[PDB]
Write an enzyme that holds these catalytic residues in place. Structure first.
Site, PDB file in Angstrom:
ATOM      1  N   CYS A 201       8.841   4.368  -2.008  1.00  0.00           N
ATOM      2  CA  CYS A 201       7.620   3.717  -0.739  1.00  0.00           C
ATOM      3  C   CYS A 201       8.008   5.394   0.013  1.00  0.00           C
ATOM      4  CB  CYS A 201       8.645   3.226   0.219  1.00  0.00           C
ATOM      5  SG  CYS A 201       7.557   2.462   1.517  1.00  0.00           S
TER       6      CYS A 201
ATOM      7  N   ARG B  91       8.374   5.747   3.712  1.00  0.00           N
ATOM      8  CA  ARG B  91       9.672   5.625   4.681  1.00  0.00           C
ATOM      9  C   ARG B  91       9.485   5.979   6.419  1.00  0.00           C
ATOM     10  NH1 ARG B  91      13.396   7.290   0.297  1.00  0.00           N
ATOM     11  NH2 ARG B  91      11.145   8.011  -0.538  1.00  0.00           N
TER      12      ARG B  91
ATOM     13  N   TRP C 267       1.952  -2.214   6.367  1.00  0.00           N
ATOM     14  CA  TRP C 267       0.569  -2.236   5.998  1.00  0.00           C
ATOM     15  C   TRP C 267      -0.005  -1.133   5.663  1.00  0.00           C
ATOM     16  CZ3 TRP C 267       3.547  -0.075  10.525  1.00  0.00           C
ATOM     17  CH2 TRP C 267       3.800   1.527  10.538  1.00  0.00           C
TER      18      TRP C 267
ATOM     19  N   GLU D  30      -3.802   1.734  -1.807  1.00  0.00           N
ATOM     20  CA  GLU D  30      -3.515   0.354  -2.456  1.00  0.00           C
ATOM     21  C   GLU D  30      -4.937  -0.302  -3.266  1.00  0.00           C
ATOM     22  OE1 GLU D  30       0.348  -0.606  -0.965  1.00  0.00           O
ATOM     23  OE2 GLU D  30      -0.332   0.576   0.425  1.00  0.00           O
TER      24      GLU D  30
END
Ligand code: HEM
Ligand code: HEM
Ligand code: S85
Ligand code: S85
Ligand code: H4B
Ligand code: H4B
Ligand code: ZN
Lengths: 411, 407
Positions: free
Chosen positions: B106, B109, B278, B283
């Site tokens: 991720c 983070r 969010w 992406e």
């Protein structure tokens, strides 16, 4: 044991058995993955297994495994090691070895070409002037007026580690960098240190933004010597853009011949510490990394300014936009001058074909995803979606320390 | 065994000590790196519980206190007794925040500690799950000003009574095959979509139909629910330069909310733990829109731009990619729905990585996943060496429920 890899775009699954022949270590354990770490004097003892295993592979590839010629050769190398403590490769074995080190090179996207490699045997070379001569011939031959040909030149192998041949340059052709007193850098920041050694050694530096460096050559463990590649042998391409006429006014050029000179080639346990090899460029090596890394030419701001993009916020993607235009410019300039080059769409696609072929004919293809995936437009290239298994096969290319760190000076 | 990582762009060197607390295994060995592979009883439970309570009481500086000992004591009692145990709220929350802190894939983070945790361990039926999920959605959406959240359903018991959300995300578009043999909507959901059709959803058969939820409580057969459409915030996609962009008819949803993962805290498994934050613009604009097996709109866009699609070497794909991504960010920004670009998000991750090195002695990170799928080397994470290893609490993959559910 079999290992499967999947392509998540096509759903093709491949099965790797080749990793079973792997020797060297990765740097990873069951507890830590070191897959993004950049970098993760030999006795008679270790040498015979290493020879044996190489010659078994050589003899298999020629369908002569277990032949009398095969056994005599083991026999012969065996005696040569015991009595002289090293051994000499036949020409055929050197050629096969050099090709395989490329074939095995897991960070190399251009491997579909591995079997067309011109091997120049320079093991009779004894002096730095002789090295210069060999390297000039390699450059002219590889360049071939823009129709580039892969080649490698192989200088004598390591003996006691006190007599090493080394090319001090990291690439045969590269631009000088000069740290200025105000802290800015003129030319290529990546070569400042090496530029300084050259200067210290006596190079009269023109001090421009694009000065081809002198060759700095070490034969037989002696102090290295400077030589200037004849300029007529250095093919260069001025960078312009197909639509943006101010692009040429940026003053950019690059050289045509990417030629790595600082790696160590290992073949059957012998160490070739000077083995310059060259191919042709993929456009992003210049357009993304050389021009746009922050720690390199770093032209992004000046390109985007001239394009008059909105530079006040990152989320305009001004960086990404300038980046594409620069890479169009590099590929356009090279094509227009008829100098061989490959874009990252064509390269990665060829690589996927190569890799599948390798699985079918060879049982695998070691590949380092971190390096194979191009530095722009990652996931619109088929390799991003390809699972890869990274392991180390020999023959191989290896890193070695920079010679100014280890060299014992004579004076 | 004390490990260094270097940033090749800036020369900053960090030493990693935290990996020496790695529990789980990587898939790698000394002979083979599996770095690019997508997925590589009472006795067991007590060390897991202890290791967890140790880090907890350490985090609140009562390591070795009576309250620490008493708690280990109590949980031991309860495991021996009940063969499982129950987390205190405080542990649950620490557990969830840490599973995110530990998520090596991720990039987002830096936010890890501002996670709103909704305890749904009192949930018993699928209607209850639907209610909890609608509240999570509405809370996290917050009219476009998005806030991180997770909702935790009851933990696995004998594995015959699992709670699961069958959807992979709370909000996703349906996928249908045509007579045409092409695919309408999102090809990645074709199969889930037919499970919805075959469980009774009346599908509208459009290109962007929000799928229904398929909720499974206490091991029962899952049930369909539609999310009130007014809770699903969507964004029409336009370009600030190309007026025709809008007529492509693209929209996306504001709320990324992963629902198929297993949350593991001190040995206990929460098989239904939907969480949300969010989007980072790539992406949607790089993966959702341009992947070949996704909406795959590169060709149509390049055509509208009238680029030379004759030769891969004009970089027409690269060109249309940048534009598609500019349009995603622009649209979210214009409608005031929280979004982050890849430059901003990776620069923030580098800052987090430095905070974690300094304050925790490391930060597990998976370079393959952390580097964005466009413009890799122009983001600072490309030049950053990362050490990937597995810390617990964690989110883990788990088999798709339809492969496991005895109906
Ligand atoms: C024919 C054209 C070739 C292309 C387009 C090509 C492409 C590349 C590129 C893009 C890289 C990564 C470079 C970087 O980002 O630093 C690479 C790595 C490499 N290639 Fe090639 N390559 C070619 C030919 C060759 C040849 C002739 C050899 C040796 C005979 C070779 C051996 C390697 C090795 C050893 C590496 C990895 C270097 C490392 O660990 O730093 N390649 N290749
Ligand atoms: C605040 C905004 C967030 C951003 C921008 C973000 C960014 C990302 C991205 C880009 C990925 C890779 C996703 C993909 O390419 O499929 C990812 C993976 C992940 N993130 Fe986040 N994240 C955010 C919040 C969260 C939260 C709230 C959690 C859990 C509480 C979480 C846990 C994860 C996990 C477990 C993965 C990897 C899962 C896997 O192995 O596929 N993230 N993050
Ligand atoms: C730390 N790594 C940077 C310098 N380096 C050791 C290097 C080695 C290679 F084999 C290849 C390259 C890339 C240059 C190159 C070399 C060749 C032979 C072909 C091609 N397209 N590009 C760099
Ligand atoms: C091929 N990838 C596997 C799918 N998957 C299980 C997944 C898991 C995540 F945590 C996150 C994601 C990405 C969606 C996402 C999720 C969250 C919580 C934030 C954000 N910006 N994006 C996918
Ligand atoms: C830290 C990281 O491994 C390093 O930046 C790598 C990433 N991938 C790369 N890939 C290529 N082809 N060349 C490189 O120099 C790098 N650098
Ligand atoms: C094969 C490879 O592991 C796979 O394509 C990965 C690459 N990197 C990724 N990175 C992110 N963030 N998300 C992904 O889905 C993937 N896919
Ligand atoms: Zn690994």
């Amino acid at each position: 044991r079999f290992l499967k890899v999947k392509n998540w775009e096509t759903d093709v699954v491949l099965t790797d058995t080749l990793h079973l022949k792997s020797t060297l270590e990765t740097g990873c354990t069951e507890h830590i993955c070191m897959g993004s770490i950049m970098l993760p004097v030999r006795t008679k003892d270790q040498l015979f297994p290493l020879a044996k295993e190489f010659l078994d592979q050589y003899y298999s590839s020629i369908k002569r495994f277990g032949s009398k010629a095969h056994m005599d050769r083991l026999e012969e190398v065996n005696k040569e090691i015991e009595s002289t403590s090293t051994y000499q490769l036949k020409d055929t074995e050197l050629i096969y070895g050099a090709k395989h080190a490329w074939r095995n090179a897991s960070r190399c996207v251009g491997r579909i070409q591995w079997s067309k490699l011109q091997v120049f045997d320079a093991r009779d070379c004894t002096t730095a002037h002789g090295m210069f001569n060999y390297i000039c011939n390699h450059v002219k031959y590889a360049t071939n007026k823009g129709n580039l040909r892969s080649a490698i030149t192989i200088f004598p192998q390591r003996t006691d580690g006190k007599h090493d041949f080394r090319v001090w340059n990291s690439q045969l052709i590269r631009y000088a960098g000069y740290k200025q007193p105000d802290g800015s850098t003129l030319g290529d920041p990546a070569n400042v240190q090496f530029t300084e050694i050259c200067i210290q050694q006596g190079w009269k530096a023109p001090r421009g933004r694009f000065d081809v460096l002198p060759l700095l050559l070490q034969a037989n463990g002696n102090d290295p010597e400077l030589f200037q590649i004849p300029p007529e042998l250095v093919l260069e391409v001025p960078i312009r853009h197909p639509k943006f006429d101010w692009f040429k006014d940026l003053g950019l050029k690059w050289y045509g011949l990417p030629a790595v000179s600082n790696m160590l080639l290992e073949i059957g346990g012998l160490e070739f510490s000077a083995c310059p090899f060259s191919g042709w460029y993929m456009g992003t090596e210049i357009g993304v990394r050389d021009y746009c890394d922050n720690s390199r030419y770093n032209i992004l701001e000046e390109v985007a300014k001239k394009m008059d993009l909105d530079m006040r916020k990152t989320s305009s993607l001004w960086k990404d936009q300038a980046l594409v235009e620069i890479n169009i410019a590099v590929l356009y300039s090279f094509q227009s001058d008829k100098v061989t080059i490959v874009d990252h769409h064509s390269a990665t696609e060829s690589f996927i074909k190569h890799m599948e072929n390798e699985y079918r004919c060879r049982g695998g293809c070691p590949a380092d995803w971190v390096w194979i995936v191009p530095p722009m437009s990652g996931s619109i290239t088929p390799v991003f979606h390809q699972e890869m298994l990274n392991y180390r096969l020999t023959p191989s290319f290896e890193y070695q320390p920079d010679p100014w760190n280890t060299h014992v000076w004579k004076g």
